Amino acid sequence: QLQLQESGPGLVKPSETLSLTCTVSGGSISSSSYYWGWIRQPPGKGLEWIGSIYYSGSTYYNPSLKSRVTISVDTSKNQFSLKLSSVTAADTAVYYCAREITMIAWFDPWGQGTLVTVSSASTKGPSVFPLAPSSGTAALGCLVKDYFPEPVTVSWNSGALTSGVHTFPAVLQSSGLYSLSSVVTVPSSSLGTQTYICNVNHKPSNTKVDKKVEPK
């Protein structure tokens, strides 16, 4: 089963070069039946194809970005990469890699997508505060405050608790820093026995925090 894992920094300064790599597992990138492409999606906007590459090295680019784009392939390391030069804020987007079949408009499978923020601003890690449950069912959560840039990842009990979880879209504050909350509804009878831990991950700052939520 073919899997695509993409990697690269989510923060690039203006005029600098965006760089991303897609690693192929469960199959060979040296297949004569597939091309390997990059698609991007600005926040709140649609999908734009950047370019595709064959394992021999032949490339097809979106002509609206051809002067600024390079796509390479490394068959020995089963990877293909993307370089976008002189990036501007207009290049802030989620970048996806995908396996392509030509002519039939086939992109399958996809990478999970990497958000790249084009900004000269400095990275800032978040502070995490508990939304303590106060009261059949109770609500509790975490406040992830003051970080830059997006995104943060929030799970509960290292992923073991998913039902009832609502992680809200991040909110931009007047200072220019982001803030979000994640909440979950649980039975009140589980509050003094079951443990509820929110796991906040912010890869731009390499900060991972576990805040245990207890009734105040």
């Binding site: 649609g46 999908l47 996809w110």
Partner: protein, 213 residues
């Protein structure tokens, strides 16, 4: 370049209805058309390739048709998990272009929100700011109003709201409102109230607490 005009931009349909999305190419592209489904925070998923070929694993209620310039994606019996944004893609002449996308919303019965209020944590009051959070859980439709009262005085300009996308199982929404105050001002007052008005409530629901207790 070849342009894909996708329509409509957004639609609202009930479970069991037939959803029809159309995509028009600026010139003929034979059947070099694909249909993609994108759920919140996830990569687009291939549904149909070559205009009308169903991808393995995709439920049979999805179907595509058309050749030349007019293409149609049809969901015969809409399901709650089908909430997504759908995209057409053409790759004629090896130059790829996407349609603008169609946001498909699920229409369901009115559900009143459950309201919770959270006081500021103790370790945040050590930093000098206080954040009061109000949670509106699992409601439909999306329209809701939240008002903050500090000692029964209305607040403005010191709060922000966030709304989840439609839940893939119950088709409801959730909203969180965060009122941020300075620590110095959080301690001047006692009563902190969150007041919500929604179509599913016979009258506004207010959750509140008193600093301490």
């Amino acid at each position: 370049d070849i342009q894909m005009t996708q329509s409509p931009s957004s639609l609202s349909a009930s479970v069991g209805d037939r959803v029809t999305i159309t995509c028009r190419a600026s010139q003929g592209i034979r059947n070099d058309l694909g249909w993609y489904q994108q759920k919140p925070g996830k990569a687009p998923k291939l549904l149909i390739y070559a205009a009308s070929s169903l991808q393995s694993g995709v439920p049979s209620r999805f179907s595509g048709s058309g050749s030349g310039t007019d293409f149609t994606l049809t969901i015969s019996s809409l399901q709650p998990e089908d909430f997504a944004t759908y995209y057409c893609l053409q790759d004629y002449n090896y130059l790829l272009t996407f349609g603008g996308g169609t946001k498909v919303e699920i229409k369901r019965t009115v559900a009143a929100p459950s309201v919770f209020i959270f006081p500021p944590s103790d370790e945040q009051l050590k930093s000098g700011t206080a954040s009061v959070v109000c949670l509106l859980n699992n409601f439909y439709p999306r329209e809701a109003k939240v008002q903050w009262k500090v000692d029964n005085a209305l607040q403005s300009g010191n709060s922000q709201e966030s709304v989840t996308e439609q839940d893939s199982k119950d088709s409801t929404y959730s909203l969180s409102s965060t009122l941020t105050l300075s620590k110095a001002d959080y301690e001047k007052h006692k009563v902190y109230a969150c007041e919500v008005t929604h179509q599913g409530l016979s009258s506004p629901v207010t959750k509140s607490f008193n600093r301490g207790e």
